[PDB]
């Protein structure tokens, strides 16, 4: 309205804005062995996939881009551009060689021979999949038969389940009894790779990375540089992946040697310890409130 009567009215709200940003990360100086996972010159078959675990190091993903112009780089639980600042508990890496046209079979909620009999991913998968061509490396002129894949299995595979049993498959009522006769077939089929093969059959090296969130004090994060510490000011803070805003003050809270955080009745964070220097600090929300306008009549 263009006319206001005498009284008090609630119009809007206000909040104190942050001043700067504070960043604190651990002091580990190691480099995560992502290099050894790649460029290994020997990749196991899909039916027996190697599983490696990475922890207690600084993870740098620049070598990933420096490796090659990858055919496929697909991240599901996170965004590929923001892996440089996240913090994880443990990292799992699975590497193997597969056919070119079957790369699409590696994804949550997918069906296929590799999907059900060789390698299965959980529906809540939180990680990335990388696939790059390696035709010049793993293709003999006569044919490479070292890579094999399972073809027959009675039941489907659970997520992250590995099978290495090699027994003659029985497809009928009669038992094979140790011979590969009629209606009895070997479970493993050997790939044939030749340089004359076109796209869709040349070998591809695939690495699947899985991240572990919401666990014990995380360790796998050191890419971003830390900063200094300020107190008694409205500021943004990032403590080992815990991001927030507020005022940091000295704390008189008796933390036992194994706690990291602190909660209240309302179940909100109120205390935190600095990873670089063991010291307890309290966090308070910055000032906010409402604004009321007092005015007589516009007349």
């Amino acid at each position: 309205s263009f006319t206001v009567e005498k009284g008090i009215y609630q119009t809007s709200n206000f909040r104190v804005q942050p001043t700067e940003s504070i960043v604190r990360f651990p002091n580990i100086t190691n480099l995560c062995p992502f290099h050894e996972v790649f460029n290994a010159t020997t990749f196991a078959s899909v039916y027996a996939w190697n599983r490696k675990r990475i922890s207690n190091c600084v993870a740098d993903y620049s070598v990933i881009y420096n490796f090659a112009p990858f055919f496929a780089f697909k991240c599901y639980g996170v965004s590929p551009t923001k892996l440089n600042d996240l913090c994880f508990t443990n990292v799992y890496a699975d590497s193997f060689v597969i056919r070119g046209n079957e790369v699409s079979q590696i994804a949550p909620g997918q069906t296929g021979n590799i999907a059900d009999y060789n390698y299965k991913l959980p529906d809540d998968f939180t990680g990335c999949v990388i696939a790059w061509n390696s035709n010049k490396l793993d293709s003999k002129p006569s044919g490479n038969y070292n890579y094999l894949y399972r073809l027959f299995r009675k039941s489907k595979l659970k997520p992250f389940e590995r099978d290495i049993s090699t027994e003659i498959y029985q497809a009928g009522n009669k038992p094979c009894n140790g011979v590969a006769g009629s209606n009895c077939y070997s479970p493993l089929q050997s790939y044939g790779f030749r340089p004359t093969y076109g796209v869709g059959h040349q070998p591809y090296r695939v690495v699947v990375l899985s991240f572990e969130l919401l666990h014990a004090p995380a360790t796998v994060c050191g890419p971003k540089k830390s900063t200094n510490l300020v107190k008694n000011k409205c500021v943004n803070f990032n403590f080992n992946g815990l991001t927030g805003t507020g005022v940091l003050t000295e704390s008189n809270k008796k933390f036992l040697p194994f706690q990291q955080f602190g909660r209240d009745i309302a179940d909100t964070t109120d205390a935190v310890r600095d990873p670089q220097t063991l010291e307890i600090l309290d966090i308070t929300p910055c000032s906010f409130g409402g604004v009321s306008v007092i005015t007589p009549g516009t007349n």
């Binding site: 639980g77 996170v78 965004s79 923001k82 600042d85 996240l86 991001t243 927030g244």
Partner: peptide, 9 residues
Amino acid sequence: LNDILSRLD
């Protein structure tokens, strides 16, 4: 909300 914003697009 901050976790979703810092982990996604």
